[PDB]
Design a protein around this ligand. Structure first.
Ligand code: THM
Ligand code: NI
Length: 330
């Protein structure tokens, strides 16, 4: 209102104190074309903005298994004061690290830790993007049979599954959803054989929600499509990032095309960047639970190769989810 007692601080003497941020990666690795890669692309974009480089202000620690989580979190505490655990599985390990290092800030992606001041929790309404993926799938199936390849049976993949089923049903409950789980997010070979089985049983679209396990689903659909007309190709739906690039193939009849129908987006990269900036400004949302949904565009659908009828069905379903008229289960 007034500030009579004041002093001028010359810009020459001012600085903003920076932070150093690292991600501890799950099984999938930073080359999973999906979840962990999204996080890493986000941390790199934050580094560029802050004039940093790899191992000079930001880095990743790749986890080899569940036992490596604690080791990687301890290593990260050496040089980094903002540490992301990327995946629900890191829940217990982040809890323990946050209690050893009360001076450092921790972020858990895809699960919730309560009552720890130095831990923020980030969740996505993956059911809402799953729903749109379901609507998209229903409006393009010829065989009225679609596949769902999950990674690890969990709260997180259950949201995608429930959402996807609800979304197919909202268009045509006739349509059969074959559900199979690979038991891993880093097992391409199991994805290949589950996809092979789902396509063989008459699925013409597979939603792969299995991280790097999903590379196998792409490899399978590529083989089937590489030995057929473009007319009769089978589709996969991408997850976490726009996966259009992974769907590039040549038909048997000479034609270059793409078998990625659509991708669910999960803006993990954006979350890493936005929270890294909050942390650096000394406004880290400790103890809070940040929920990203369709409303704030934290999840969305990329309508890559979808038909115009498909795009309209998705926009109408999105509208109804944003209204509150349609409630998506978990
Ligand atoms: C690749 C990967 C995915 N996921 C989860 C979150 C993703 O949104 C979903 C599908 O990529 O699987 C993990 O929990 N850990 C991983 O290592
Ligand atoms: Ni004074």
């Amino acid at each position: 209102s007034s500030h009579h007692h004041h002093h001028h601080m010359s810009g020459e003497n001012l600085y903003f104190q920076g932070a150093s941020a690292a991600i501890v990666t799950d099984t999938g690795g930073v080359d999973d074309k999906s979840f962990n890669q999204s996080a890493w692309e986000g941390l790199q974009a934050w580094g560029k903005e802050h004039n940093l480089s790899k191992d000079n202000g930001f880095t990743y620690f790749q986890s080899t298994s569940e036992a490596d989580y604690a080791n990687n979190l301890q290593q990260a505490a050496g040089s980094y004061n903002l540490i992301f655990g990327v995946g629900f599985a890191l829940n217990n390990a982040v809890k323990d690290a946050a209690k050893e290092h009360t001076d450092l800030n921790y972020v858990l992606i895809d699960d919730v830790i309560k009552d720890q001041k130095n831990v923020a929790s980030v969740t996505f309404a993956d059911n809402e993007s799953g729903y749109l993926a379901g609507v998209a799938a229903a409006k393009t199936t010829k065989t009225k049979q679609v596949g769902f390849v999950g990674g690890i049976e969990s709260e997180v993949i259950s949201r995608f599954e429930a959402g996807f089923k609800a979304g197919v049903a909202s268009v045509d409950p006739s349509i059969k959803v074959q559900v199979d789980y690979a038991g891993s997010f880093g097992d391409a070979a199991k994805g290949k054989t589950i996809a092979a089985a789902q396509y063989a049983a008459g699925a013409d679209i597979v939603y792969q929600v299995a991280g790097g396990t999903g590379a196998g689903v792409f490899a399978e659909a590529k083989s089937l499509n590489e030995s057929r007309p473009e007319n009769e190709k089978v589709w996969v739906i991408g997850v976490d990032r726009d996966q259009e690039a992974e769907g590039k193939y040549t038909s048997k009849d000479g034609k270059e095309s793409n078998f990625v129908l659509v991708s669910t987006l999960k803006q993990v990269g954006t979350t890493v960047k936005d929270i890294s900036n909050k942390a650096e400004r000394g406004e880290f949302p400790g103890g809070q639970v940040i929920v990203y949904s369709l409303k704030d565009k934290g999840v969305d659908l990329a309508v890559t190769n979808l038909s115009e009828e498909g795009k309209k069905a998705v926009e109408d379903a999105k509208a109804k989810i944003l209204d509150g008229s349609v409630k998506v289960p978990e």
